[PDB]
Write a protein that binds this ligand. Structure first.
Ligand SMILES: Cc1cc2nc3c(=O)[nH]c(=O)nc-3n(C[C@H](O)[C@H](O)[C@H](O)COP(=O)(O)O)c2cc1C
Ligand SMILES: [Mg+2]
Length: 196
């Protein structure tokens, strides 16, 4: 899956509410969801994976706030908003939501990270600004962990290609691919140390 590197393994036990979406697939589906997200929303992983996150919206959701998310995704920018969402039971909650693109080493947007902080009320003022700093710091910790997981998945994918080329006696291909593997390994090791 698009989530096999996680991300799932790298991501889902982080005790934060988040999803990862893949904007390079139809309708930017959720490809990973944290265990905590499923408990918040009360949906199962199988109900959520492969669907767009908009299912959380309902009758009182501010459509102009939703458009600010829409525009940030289209523009590939971060955004922080607060909007009304509903659990599977129809329980209303306020979702203080932070989106940010996750880039690969070339700077291209590979995934979106979305971090939720649920509450009973629309927060403002110092309470809001603090909650925003929590979810931004959480998003940064997910971004680095997910980037490391994506380098590990790239290393596994190139080792498969190297073995295929070795089986086929494709030695110019082996040479090319082993140089790429050496750069991926260096990148992986560098980022591993930073977050160690
Ligand atoms: C990473 C990510 C997570 C999202 N999480 C939520 C969420 O928690 N609640 C929500 O109402 N929308 C969420 N969305 C927003 C919707 O998926 C969608 O982008 C929004 O409704 C605007 O597009 P639409 O007008 O086509 O629905 C998320 C989007 C992304 C990319
Ligand atoms: Mg979308």
């Amino acid at each position: 899956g698009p989530g096999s590197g996680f991300l799932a393994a790298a991501l889902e036990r982080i005790e934060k509410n988040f999803v990862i979406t893949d904007p390079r697939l139809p309708d930017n589906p959720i490809i990973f969801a944290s265990d905590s997200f499923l408990q918040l929303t009360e949906y199962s992983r199988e109900e959520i994976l492969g669907r767009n996150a908009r299912f959380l919206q309902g009758p009182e959701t501010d459509r102009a706030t939703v458009r600010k998310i829409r525009d940030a995704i289209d523009n590939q920018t971060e955004v922080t908003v607060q909007l009304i969402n509903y659990t599977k039971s129809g329980k209303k909650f306020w979702n203080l939501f932070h989106l940010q693109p996750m880039r690969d080493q070339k700077g291209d947007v590979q995934y979106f990270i979305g971090v939720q902080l649920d509450g009973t009320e629309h927060v403002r003022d110092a309470a809001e600004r603090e909650a925003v700093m929590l979810i931004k710091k959480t998003a940064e910790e997910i971004d680095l962990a997910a980037k490391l997981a994506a380098l590990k998945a790239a290393i596994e994918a190139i080792i498969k290609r190297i073995e295929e080329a070795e089986k086929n006696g494709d030695e110019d291909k082996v040479k090319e691919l082993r140089e790429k593997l050496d750069k991926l390994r260096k990148a992986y090791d560098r980022l591993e140390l930073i977050i160690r």
